[PDB]
Amino acid sequence: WHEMWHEGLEEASRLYFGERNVKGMFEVLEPLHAMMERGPQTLKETSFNQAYGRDLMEAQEWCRKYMKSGNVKDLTQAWDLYYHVFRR
């Protein structure tokens, strides 16, 4: 699970910062948003819940604060959370 979020952040950040991506960035993120509906079952899946599973569902709300106008301060907290979990 935690192996794919590396390139999932490295693509979705660098497209938006270098190649002027607007709608394709959500297309890159949407396989990752269509994954966490099955739920944790095992011990490693519980460790992923207690290690990272607090800000992955919440950051979509920040995306819901981005779709109305496209503000900067309504999205940079999600970038802060992504840059915090990327190093971890």
Partner: protein, 379 residues
């Protein structure tokens, strides 16, 4: 008579200090501000609230030195009868900015005046100071977010917890998120009081009508139990002193009142500790802090040896009158020998291991009727 002439002289001195630059008249302006603060402390009833508004408007220009604002902040904490309750937005965008920039400037006089102003705002009222608490939330969070490179960042974090005595509807946005971060990096005696104060505030919020504002902190009560126990589930790391400080503060919070763990969180905390003790030998060493709460004798043997464990259990007493205690220690040594035989009977003769695992059948019925678990505590 005299007060109406003294307030006009202070207003003229403030106007002359505002009309000045003031490069060469900085000491004279500081002396005039000290004299005005002494006159306001001697008399704070003349003539209206316009002088306080002029002093609050002149306080932004007096923070240039910034030693001149440290004497003016002391006057606002003595004449704060109804100026903060009427006009709170006139200084909320300046006092919080002066308190947030005091850590970057490195001034003790600017750090003491902001703490004195925060204490004067916390001691007067709490419902009327909601805007001042919301405006100073970033200055209260920057001390907890930058405590690694600053030495004075840990002083404001202890003073910000004294201001949140009620904590009902003051901020409700970053109060519980930063309270569990400073406790996992401070010492045992410095985090034992803050965790107990947070548990008392959560119990007071659950007992009052604002039960929904503190019902989501159980995960905040779980991660502090997960930073020493569930931290070695994926990858083992140490941080041994941090885990030992997090286990002792959690043990003190569980032995202080225990109104939060019972009864939907203690069963999940005991199962996580049982899974961590049955995972490896590194995570199984945190049980002694679980044993130091009621049956404390963990420093008797330093893992050496199996023959010296009975001698350590015999020397764990005083031992003036240990007639029954010697028989209890002999029974505990015989039970440990039976457990060692069950461990050495792996893995085709595990009936004794199942007898040791199911050895709490009559002990659970005896403690529910007579409340006597001395043999269970010895085992």
């Amino acid at each position: 008579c005299e007060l109406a002439l003294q307030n006009p002289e202070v207003v003229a001195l403030r106007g002359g200090l505002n009309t000045i630059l003031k490069n060469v008249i900085d000491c004279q302006l500081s002396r005039i501000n000290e004299a005005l603060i002494t006159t306001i402390l001697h008399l704070l009833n003349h003539p209206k609230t316009r002088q306080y508004v002029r002093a609050d408007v002149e306080l932004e220009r007096i923070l240039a030195p910034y030693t001149d604002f440290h004497y003016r902040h002391s006057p606002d904490t003595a004449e704060g009868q109804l100026k903060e309750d009427r006009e709170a937005r006139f200084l909320a965008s300046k006092m919080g900015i002066i308190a947030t920039f005091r850590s970057w400037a490195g001034i003790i006089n600017l750090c003491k005046p902001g703490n004195s102003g925060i204490q004067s705002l916390i001691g007067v009222l709490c419902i009327p100071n909601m805007e001042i608490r919301r405006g100073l939330l970033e200055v209260l969070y920057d001390i907890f977010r930058l405590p690694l490179p600053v030495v004075t960042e840990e002083f404001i974090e202890a003073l910000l917890s004294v201001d949140p005595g009620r904590f009902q509807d003051s901020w409700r946005l970053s109060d519980g998120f930063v309270a569990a971060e400073a406790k996992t990096i401070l010492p045992h005696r410095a985090r034992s009081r803050p965790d107990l104060m947070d548990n008392y505030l959560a119990l007071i919020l659950s007992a009052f009508i604002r039960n929904g504002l503190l019902e989501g902190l159980v995960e905040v009560i779980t991660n502090s139990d997960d930073h020493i126990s569930v931290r070695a589930t994926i990858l083992l790391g140490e941080l041994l002193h941090m885990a030992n400080t997090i286990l002792p503060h959690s043990h003190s919070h569980h032995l202080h009142c225990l109104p939060t763990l019972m009864n939907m969180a203690a069963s999940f905390d005991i199962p996580k500790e049982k899974r961590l003790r049955a995972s490896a030998a590194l995570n199984c060493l945190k049980r002694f802090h679980e044993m130091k709460k009621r049956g404390p004798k963990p420093y008797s043997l330093h893992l050496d040896h199996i023959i010296q464990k009975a001698i350590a259990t015999h020397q764990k007493r005083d031992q003036y009158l240990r007639v029954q205690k010697d028989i209890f220690i002999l029974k505990d040594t015989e039970e440990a020998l039976l457990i060692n035989l069950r461990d050495s009977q792996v893995l085709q003769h595990k009936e004794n291991l199942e007898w040791n695992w199911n050895l709490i059948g009559t002990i659970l019925k005896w403690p529910n009727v007579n409340l006597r678990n001395y043999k269970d505590e010895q085992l």
